[PDB]
Design a protein around this ligand. Sequence first.
Ligand SMILES: CC(C)(COP(=O)(O)OP(=O)(O)OC[C@H]1O[C@@H](n2cnc3c(N)ncnc32)[C@H](O)[C@@H]1OP(=O)(O)O)[C@@H](O)C(=O)NCCC(=O)NCCS
Ligand SMILES: CC(C)(COP(=O)(O)OP(=O)(O)OC[C@H]1O[C@@H](n2cnc3c(N)ncnc32)[C@H](O)[C@@H]1OP(=O)(O)O)[C@@H](O)C(=O)NCCC(=O)NCCS
Lengths: 417, 417
Amino acid sequence: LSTPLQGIKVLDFTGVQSGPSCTQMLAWFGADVIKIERPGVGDVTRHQLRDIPDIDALYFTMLNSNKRSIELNTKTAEGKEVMEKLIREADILVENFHPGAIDHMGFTWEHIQEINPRLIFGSIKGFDECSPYVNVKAYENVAQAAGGAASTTGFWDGPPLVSAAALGDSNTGMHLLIGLLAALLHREKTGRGQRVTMSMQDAVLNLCRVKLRDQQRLDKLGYLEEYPQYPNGTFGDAVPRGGNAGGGGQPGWILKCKGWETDPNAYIYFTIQEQNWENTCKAIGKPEWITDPAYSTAHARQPHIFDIFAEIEKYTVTIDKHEAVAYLTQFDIPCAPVLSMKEISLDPSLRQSGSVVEVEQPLRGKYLTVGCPMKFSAFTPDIKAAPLLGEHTAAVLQELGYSDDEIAAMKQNHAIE
Amino acid sequence: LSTPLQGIKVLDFTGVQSGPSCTQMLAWFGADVIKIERPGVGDVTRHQLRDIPDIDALYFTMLNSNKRSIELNTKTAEGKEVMEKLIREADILVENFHPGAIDHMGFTWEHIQEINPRLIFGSIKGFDECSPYVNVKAYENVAQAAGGAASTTGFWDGPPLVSAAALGDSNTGMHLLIGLLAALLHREKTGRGQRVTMSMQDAVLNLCRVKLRDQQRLDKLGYLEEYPQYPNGTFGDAVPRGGNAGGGGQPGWILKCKGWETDPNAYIYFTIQEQNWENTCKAIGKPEWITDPAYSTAHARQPHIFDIFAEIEKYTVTIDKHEAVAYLTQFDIPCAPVLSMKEISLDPSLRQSGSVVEVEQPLRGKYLTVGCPMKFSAFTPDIKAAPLLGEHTAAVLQELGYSDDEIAAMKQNHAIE
Ligand SMILES: CC(C)(COP(=O)(O)OP(=O)(O)OC[C@H]1O[C@@H](n2cnc3c(N)ncnc32)[C@H](O)[C@@H]1OP(=O)(O)O)[C@@H](O)C(=O)NCCC(=O)NCCS
Ligand SMILES: CC(C)(COP(=O)(O)OP(=O)(O)OC[C@H]1O[C@@H](n2cnc3c(N)ncnc32)[C@H](O)[C@@H]1OP(=O)(O)O)[C@@H](O)C(=O)NCCC(=O)NCCS
C-alpha cells in the first residue's frame, strides 16, 4: 500500500559497491532510483567477474535491483544540461567517484545547492576531507587496512587479514544510507537539503569501535586479560591479532567438528558465556568444573582457557557441526555452525525470511541476491531485476520534458560521433 | 540550531553492543534517549573489561554517550506501570534482549501497539523469526559464523576466522538504525508506527553479499578465476577462504613493509587496479611489463599474480609503510598502510574529522570514542559523556508526572526490599 520513500526521487551517480548498495536500498524503500551511467560501458560491475558472456555480471545484478538506467555522458555540454534538469527535480543525488571527479564536471556541492536547495547530496570517498589520504583511491581492502580492521583481524603470528565482509564497500553504503535518511527527516523541519559525506575509512572504524576500547585498556594496563597473549605471551604498543577470540566480554573460539580435515566449514563458533558456566559444564560432562576454583569464575578460567576449548573440542570434533549445535543449544550455549556460502544459498529459512531472494533477470534468468536485511511490519519490498544499460533513457528523458524527436536526435547524434 | 531528530523520544531497552550502538546514534541525531536499565547492575557493559575499579567500563562509555539512565525493574508491577507510561509518550522503543525476554514481561509488539499506535518498535535478535535458530543466543562471533563471514575469511589452509569488525554487533545496530529512520519517514505518511526487526545473522549476510555472488559464479563454472586457488589449486562446493585477496574485480594483497619481523602492522594493502597497470609498472620499475603479453591484461596476470605481488613486495619490504604509500600513491595506486589501533587513536586528521573523539566522563576523566561516522553540512553532533547508573531516574519520573514524594517513596521501598 505505501512505502517509506514513495515519491522520493534519487539520482544514482555511482559505481562498484559502496554507492550502489546505498541506492539499491533506497529503491527497496520505495524511492525511484535513476542510475546515471556513462554511455556504452556503464557501471564497471556490469562487466566484472561475468559468469555468462555478454550479459550483466552478478556483481551488477546483486547491487542494482529496482533501479532505472539512463546512459548519459556528463562531460558533454548536453549531458550536463540533462543532469542539471535531473538535479532540479530530484530529492537525493549520490556519488562515489574518485576524489575530484564530480567537482571537475561542475557539480560541486556549492552548485548543486543553487540548482536545488532541497536536494540532499550524498558522497562516498576513501577518506575524509581533512585526511592526508583525501585524494587516494580506495577499494574495499584499502579501507580495511586504513580503518584498523586488517591490523586486528587474523592471528598473532600471521599477517594482518582482510575480512570477507564488505567493511569498506557495502558497509560504507549502509552508513551513507543512515545519513541520507537522517537528512530527509531534517529537511522535514528546515525545508533544506544538505550534504552528507561518508568515508570508507570511517565506516571501517565505526565497526572497529571495540578495538579502540581495547587500545585504551592496553595503554592503561599494559595487558588485555581476555586476549590469548595473556598471561603467557606478550603485548606490544598496539592491540594485537586475537585469532578466533570472542572480541567482547564472553570468551569463545572456532571449534573443529567432524569432517574438518577435508571440509573447510566443518566447524562451529562456541561461546563460554559467564552466566551459563554451569550449563556449559553439564553440556560437556565436566560437572566437577562447576565448583573447582580453577574453573568456577571467568577470571580463574582465563589463564587456562585453551585447555577448556580443547576439552570442548574433544566433543565437537566427533559429530557433524549441525548436530553439535543441536545438542549444545539445549544447554542455552551461544553457538552456531560456520555456515558455508553454499549452505546459505540453499537455506529455506533465509528464503522464507526474504534474506536470500530469487530474482528473474532478463537474458540471464534466475539469480540470487541478498534481500532487504531489516524486516518491517508495515511493508515488504519486492525485489526486482536490475536494469539493462540505458533501458530507461527514453522514459527518463520524456519525464524531463524532452520530446520523442529530441530523444531520437540526441541518440542519433551520439551514435554518429 | 536544529538536529534531524529533535523532539524524538527514544526508549533504550538494550544491552551490550548491537542495541546500544543504534541508540547512541539516535542521541547523536538529536533524539532524547532514555536507557532503561535493571536496578543496581544496569547494562552488563558497565562492568565488563573494566580498566579502573568500580567505574563504568569503556565498553559502556563508548556505546552510551548522550543517553539518560533510569533504573527500572520491569518485572515488578510498579516497573511495568512506569514502562507503560514511557511507551505512551515515546516515538521509538528498542530492545535486544534474549529471544522471548520482553514478550514474557508483557511488552509484546501487540500490546505496545495498543498503548501507542505511533510507536516504532525496534528489535534485534540473533536470528529471524522463522529460523530454526530463532531461540538461540547470539554474541558477535556466533553471528559471524552463521552469516557466512567466518567461512569466507582467513586462509584456505587455516580455520574459519572471525573479523575484528563488529559484523554481528554494531553492524546489526546500524542496520536497525536504517529501519528505524525509514519507519520515521513512513509514519510521516501513514500516521502509524510499526515494528522493525533485525537479526544479527542477516546483518552479517548483507555485508557478505559479494560472497553470495561468488557462490553463484562457482556453482555455474566450477572455478573462480580471481581467487588464489586458480588455476593451480582446487575448488570445492563452497566459496573458499582467499587470504588477503581483493574480494572484487581488482586483485590485491597485504604486503610486508620494513619492520614486519617485529612489528605486526608493518604492512600495506596494495591494489592492482586494471586501468592503472601502466602506472603500476612505472611505480615498481617494470616498464617491460607494460607490453609483455604475460602481464599486459588482468586475465594474463592472474595465473602468476603472486609472482607479481612478490616483485612488488621486494620494494615494499625495504621502506616504512607510510613512505611506501607516499611513493606508490603518486602513481595513483590504491593502497594504504595497515594502521594499528594505536596509530588510529593518535591520528590528528581523525581528531579533526570528529571520527576519534575525546570525551570527559565523570569519575573517569577523558576517554576516546568513535564519533558520528557520517558528516552533515547542516549539523554537527556534540558527543557527550555516558550516564551513571540511575543518574536520571528522578528527572524521567518527574517528566512522567510523578511527584517528588512519589519518587522518594519508590526509591525507599526499593531500598527497603
Ligand atoms: C572506485 C574508484 C577507486 C574507482 O576509480 P577509477 O575507476 O580510477 O575512476 P572512476 O570510476 O571514479 O572515474 C573514472 C572517470 O569516469 C568519469 N565518469 C563517471 N561517470 C560518468 C558519466 N556519466 N559520464 C562521463 N564521465 C563519467 C569520472 O569523472 C572519471 O573521469 P575523470 O578521470 O576524467 O575525472 C573511485 O571511483 C573511488 O575511489 N571512489 C570513491 C571511493 C569508493 O566509493 N570506492 C569504491 C568502493 S566499492
Ligand atoms: C546478548 C544476549 C545473548 C545475552 O543474553 P543473557 O545475558 O543470557 O540474557 P539477557 O541480558 O537478554 O536477559 C537477562 C534477564 O534480564 C531481564 N531484564 C532485562 N532488562 C530488565 C529490566 N529493566 N528489569 C528486569 N529484568 C530485566 C530479561 O528479561 C532477562 O530475564 P528472563 O531470563 O527472566 O527473561 C541476549 O540479550 C541476546 O541473544 N540478545 C539478542 C541478540 C543480541 O542483540 N546480541 C548481543 C550482541 S552485542
